[PDB]
Amino acid sequence: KAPQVIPKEESRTGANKYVYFVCNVPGRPWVRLPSVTPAQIVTARKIKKFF
Amino acid sequence: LGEYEGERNEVGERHGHGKARLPNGDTYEGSYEFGKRHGQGTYKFKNGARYTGDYVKNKKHGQGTFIYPDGSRYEGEWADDQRHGQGVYYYVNNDTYTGEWFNHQRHGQGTYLYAETGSKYVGTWVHGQQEGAAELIHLNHRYQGKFMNKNPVGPGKYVFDIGCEQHGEYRLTDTERGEEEEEEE
Numbered sequence: 001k002a003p004q005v006i007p008k009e010e011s012r013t014g015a016n017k018y019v020y021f022v023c024n025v026p027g028r029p030w031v032r033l034p035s036v037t038p039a040q041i042v043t044a045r046k047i048k049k050f051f
Numbered sequence: 052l053g054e055y056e057g058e059r060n061e062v063g064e065r066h067g068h069g070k071a072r073l074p075n076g077d078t079y080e081g082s083y084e085f086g087k088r089h090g091q092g093t094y095k096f097k098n099g100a101r102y103t104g105d106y107v108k109n110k111k112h113g114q115g116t117f118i119y120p121d122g123s124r125y126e127g128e129w130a131d132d133q134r135h136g137q138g139v140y141y142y143v144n145n146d147t148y149t150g151e152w153f154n155h156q157r158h159g160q161g162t163y164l165y166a167e168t169g170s171k172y173v174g175t176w177v178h179g180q181q182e183g184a185a186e187l188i189h190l191n192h193r194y195q196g197k198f199m200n201k202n203p204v205g206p207g208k209y210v211f212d213i214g215c216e217q218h219g220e221y222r223l224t225d226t227e228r229g230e231e232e233e234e235e236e
Contacts, residue, residue, distance in 0.1 A: 001143050002144065002167075003167075
């Protein structure tokens with residue numbers, strides 16, 4: 001009896017309105033950050049971990 | 052009116068082995084004492100549930116397996132009073148309990164696997180709810196405290212696979228208050 005997975009919102013009217021590029025030191029190539037899934041927000045909000 | 056097979060006395064006391072159908076519609080297999088059942092056998096319910104076991108005195112007994120109507124399953128030892136000891140149960144949502152048993156409820160030392168997360172509980176049980184002298188096992192966390200109905204309580208501590216040990220106080224039902232002790236291992 002697995003739970004119903006909530007689908008991601010690839011549309012620009014959701015959490016993925018803005019693409020995000022992450023770089024570690026300037027000059028290094030920019031890393032295309034992935035998109036949001038609601039599973040990746042909740043229960044991911046409950047965890048709290050250093051980068 | 053049911054029907055039966057296997058050897059029997061002239062009176063009608065079965066003492067052989069074979070299949071059988073009961074008056075209330077369900078079928079089974081097994082051996083026979085003179086007017087009673089024993090042996091490995093297999094039971095089949097109308098609802099699809101099944102039981103294999105010792106069947107001592109026509110009662111749920113011995114090492115065996117029971118498949119319940121809801122898809123959940125058991126393997127382990129049974130006795131006349133739904134007793135006891137080592138066994139394993141698998142739940143409808145792939146979670147698994149492995150440990151001691153008593154009167155069909157979880158009792159004593161045992162392990163419960165949270166298959167959705169992969170974490171495990173390991174501790175004492177009574178009548179199904181949780182108790183202290185227990186240990187949750189997460190991917191990197193270990194508590195190592197006390198429990199009450201369902202939630203942790205009391206002067207427990209969180210142990211980590213880094214070389215640290217954090218003490219705590221679950222003063223409220225689901226909130227921890229921490230102490231200054233962060234000692235190694």
